[PDB]
Each structure stands twice: as C-alpha cells, then as structure tokens.
Amino acid sequence: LSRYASEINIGSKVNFDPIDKNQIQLFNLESSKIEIILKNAIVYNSMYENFSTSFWIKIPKYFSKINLNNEYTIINCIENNSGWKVSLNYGEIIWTLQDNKQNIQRVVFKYSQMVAISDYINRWIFITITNNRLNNSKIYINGRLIDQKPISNLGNIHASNNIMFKLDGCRDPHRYIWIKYFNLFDKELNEKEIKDLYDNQSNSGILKDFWGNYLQYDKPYYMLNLYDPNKYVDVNNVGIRGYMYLKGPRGSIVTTNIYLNSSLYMGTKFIIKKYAKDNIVRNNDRVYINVVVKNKEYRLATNASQAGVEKILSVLEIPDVGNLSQVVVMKSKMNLQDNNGNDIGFIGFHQFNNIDKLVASNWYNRQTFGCSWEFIPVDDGWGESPL
Ligand SMILES: CC(=O)N[C@H]1[C@H]([C@H](O)[C@H](O)CO)O[C@@](O[C@@H]2[C@@H](O)[C@H](O)O[C@H](CO)[C@@H]2O)(C(=O)O)C[C@@H]1O
C-alpha cells in the first residue's frame, strides 16, 4: 500500500509480519529490499519546496563491537550524488541531505544502550523528519523535537525517482530492521501535525506489548510494572493460600562497551487467554490471565469477599477456580471483574507487611499508578536468554 509509487519491487528475502502485515522486516541480505518508483509528481526536484518524511522503525539491539563505527543506509533516495537518505549506526538514526554542488548536511538522533530501561532499543519509535529549505532540517522522535541543523546554504536538491529500502554498507550479517507506515509530505510539518500523525498511526484500539507490537493471546509475557520498573512479579505459593508479589531489584544484561541494561525476562510469565476471531487483544476485551509457576499454567483469580478494597490476587489451579473472580477487561490496563459484571478494580500492587502484593483495587478506577503494566515477550531483537 503506497499512494506515492507506480511500481513496487519486492525482493525475495523481505519478511512480512503475519499478525500485522503492515510491518516489514528488512535483513542484511542482498535480496532483502523494497524499491518503489515514485509517480512523476511525487519526485522531488526543487531549491525552495519544503518536504517531510515519516515512518515507524524497530531497531534491534546492537550486540557486539562489529556494530561500532558502521554507518549503514536503510532508506536511499540519492541519485547522481543528490537527494536524501536515512541511515543508522550504533545508537544513532541519521538524516542526510545532498545538493548538486557536493554540499552535505546531517541531522542525527542519538540514544544510549547503557540505560536500565530504554524507550528506543528494539521498540517501535515514530520518526519524523521535516525540511525547510529557507532555514533548518529537523528530526522528531515520537513527536518530540530532538535536533535541528541549517540547510539554507544547500542549492538544488534533485532526489531520485526511486526509494530503496535496503540495508546498505552494514557489516553485521545478523542485522535487520522492522519498518512500517512510510509517508512523504510536500510541506514542512509543524509540531501539531506531527503530534496528530503520531497518535493517528498508533492503533489506539489495539493493545501493544513492550516492544510496540500488537498484544496477542497464547503468547507468554514477562510483566513490568511502570510505577516501579525495578521489580518483577513472583508467586509465593500456588493456591488461594498464596499470593503474587513484586520483588527486586532486576538483574543486568551486559556486554562491555556495548550495552548495559536491566534484564526483562524476569518473573512468572502471564498468558492471556480468550473468553469473550484472531489472536489480537483489543480494547475492552474480556480475557483470562494464566500465570506459569515452575513451567505449569495456573489461573489468576481472587476472592473478592476478602476484607478491604485491595483484593489480593492468587494463582489457583484452573479446574479449581469455582466462583472466584477471574475475568479481566483489557484496556489500552487490566480491570478485573466479578461474575456479576461489576468492577473489582484495576490490577496493581499494595504493601502488606513489607510485601508489595498484587491486588485488584477500585481505588485505581476512582483515581502512572501501580496499575500501569507492560507486557514483555521474548524477542530476537532483544537477545536476552530466558532463565
Ligand atoms: C507510598 C509511595 O511512596 N507511593 C505509593 C503511590 C502513591 O500514592 C502515588 O501513586 C504517587 O503518584 O501509589 C501506589 O500505592 C497506592 C496506595 O497509596 C493506596 O493507598 O492503595 C493503592 C492500592 O489500592 C496503591 O497501593 C500505587 O499507585 O500503586 C504505590 C505506593 O504505595
């Protein structure tokens, strides 16, 4: 789907996401490419006309020293040494402009791999790049302005007729990217236009996992509580006599001079089960939550007749749930309901004798709280090994 091109050439080694066919995976392989041939009107050739581009990208973590000092192109629109391109490097997204007089200007976005929880590593991020031929070129990340450089000294920019989506110059043989929702604009977008594009293309009716992919059923997720991200979920004991609690701190995954992050595959995984025709978790879906303890699934539930508004959650055997409250209404996070269809509360945590146990409390519904979760599945772009 491209309203900019008359011909779309797809190499034999382009992979498409089966759950979300909008997502395109381009490998560091020579047939892993998509060339689009712009319509004659969309082709850029001017000294004064402003233009802007936007796209979503998910960049896997850089794992080794073979990734340092290796700027490689991913989106190429340069012909006869003139035009624009998007390139990548170790912890960098790079925008480059070239005129017909060997003038070059680069605008760069930088993110670190030496952070506990990154917002960019192996996660979908919205990139917007805007260009005002009378002053500056700007790069936005998730709608926030990051950096800007002057381009007014650049003469005529005759871009290419084609746009080549392909990893070019990359020395990492395992390297790939995910890309979707490429767009071109014949104006300099302002912050509000970028803000609206970011929200419009977010698919707010579908829940997303930690990496930005669609939330799915029968997919094991490691849980992260956004109020205190240094904790992970554990199960004291299975049965109505045990509870779920948040214990910390998280571990570390390290590779010297490359990355130092918190480990994400920690704690008892959650598995979302269907209750009330695909494997996509949408807003207001009523689902079941299964929790694995020692490689065995059990049903998350509680006894809402317990004292206090904070209803401590237990992990019971599925055949032995009885009439205990278990239905969860997913929301884009988890609103546990009783069998009467009434809210018991958003799933969060509450301190009980120095133990931050997971509770379902309507105090959240009344009122970032302890009910803010992220679902972290195993992903090749992260690289960690599940313990
Ligand atoms: C005590 C503390 O430092 N933090 C609280 C936190 C804050 O009250 C608030 O979210 C700051 O923005 O809120 C959390 O705790 C809640 C309790 O304060 C409340 O009485 O009961 C809640 C459960 O029904 C919940 O435990 C939270 O938002 O989860 C965490 C912490 O206690």
Numbering used by the authors: 891 to 1166, 1170 to 1225, 1236 to 1270, 1277 to 1296
Quoted passage from the original study:
Botulinum neurotoxins (BoNT) cause the potentially fatal neuroparalytic disease botulism that arises due to proteolysis of a SNARE protein. The HC is responsible for neuronal specificity by targeting both a protein and ganglioside receptor at the neuromuscular junction. Here we present the crystal structures of two BoNT cell binding domains, HC/A4 and HC/A5, in a complex with the oligosaccharide of ganglioside, GD1a and GM1b, respectively.
Several attempts to crystallise HC/A5 with GD1a did not yield crystals for the complex. For molecule A, some additional weak electron density was observed at the GBS that was not part of the protein. With the aid of polder maps for His 1253 and Tyr 1117, it was possible to model in sugars Gal4 and Sia5. Gal4 forms a total of four hydrogen bonds with residues Glu 1203, Phe 1252, His 1253, and Ser 1264, while Sia5 forms three hydrogen bonds with Tyr 1117, Tyr 1267, and Gly 1279. Further refinement of the Gal4 molecule with occupancies 0.6 and 1 generated average B-factors of 60.74 Å2 and 61.97 Å2, respectively, indicating that GM1b is bound at low occupancy. Considering that the residues of the GBS for molecule B could not be modelled, comparisons to the unbound HC/A5 structure will be made with molecule A. Most of the residues within the putative GBS show little to no conformational change, with the exception of Phe 1278 which has its side chain flipped towards the GBS. The low occupancy of GM1b, and multiple failed attempts of co-crystallising HC/A5 with GD1a, suggested a low affinity to the Sia-Gal-GalNAc moiety or preference for a different ganglioside.
